[PDB]
């Protein structure tokens, strides 16, 4: 049968990695942005 | 300052036309001269500004197959290396 968890958990799943990603936003992002962009 | 370092980075090229200029594109990276139509592969050095950053992946600047530079350097390879 059709079963799914992450699909519904995404709300917290994304927030988890997204929120914890903040540390890589204030400064890291500037480097990654340039790196990814380059 | 950077140019000579980027230009001399390779040395003794002698490319009879069709090549890219050895200098900087985006970040402070010294790219060497190569013949037109070449996948100029070379990631970032160990540590960037204030962080180690990933250096296992190998990005490529790509040498325009005519006489210039490309648009993608695929520097994404140099990403963060933290545990969440």
From Swiss-Prot, chain B:
Cystine pairs: 6-30, 20-63, 44-78
Superkingdom field: Eukaryota
Processing and modification events after translation: C-terminal Ser or Thr residues may be phosphorylated.
Carbohydrate attachment residues: 14, 21, 54, 66, 74
Localisation: Cell membrane; Endosome
Domain notes: The transmembrane domain is composed of seven transmembrane helices that are arranged in V-shape. Transmembrane helix 7 assumes a sharply kinked structure. The antagonist CP-376395 binds at an allosteric site, far from the presumed binding site for the physiological peptide ligand.
Function: G-protein coupled receptor for CRH (corticotropin-releasing factor) and UCN (urocortin). Has high affinity for CRH and UCN. Ligand binding causes a conformation change that triggers signaling via guanine nucleotide-binding proteins (G proteins) and down-stream effectors, such as adenylate cyclase. Promotes the activation of adenylate cyclase, leading to increased intracellular cAMP levels. Inhibits the activity of the calcium channel CACNA1H. Required for normal embryonic development of the adrenal gland and for normal hormonal responses to stress.
Listed name of the protein: Corticotropin-releasing factor receptor 1
Lineage: Eukaryota, Metazoa, Chordata, Craniata, Vertebrata
């Amino acid at each position: 049968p059709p079963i799914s968890l992450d699909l519904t958990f995404n709300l917290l799943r994304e927030v988890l990695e997204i929120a914890k990603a903040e540390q890589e936003a204030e400064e890291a992002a500037k480097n990654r942005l340039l790196l990814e962009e380059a | 300052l950077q140019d000579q370092h980027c230009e001399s980075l390779s040395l003794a090229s002698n490319i009879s036309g069709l090549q890219c200029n050895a200098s900087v594109d985006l970040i402070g990276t010294c790219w060497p001269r190569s013949p037109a139509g070449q996948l100029v592969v070379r990631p970032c050095p160990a540590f960037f500004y204030g962080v180690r950053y990933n250096t296992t992946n190998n990005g490529y600047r790509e040498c325009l197959a005519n006489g210039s530079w490309a648009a993608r350097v695929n520097y994404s390879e140099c990403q963060e290396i933290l545990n969440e």
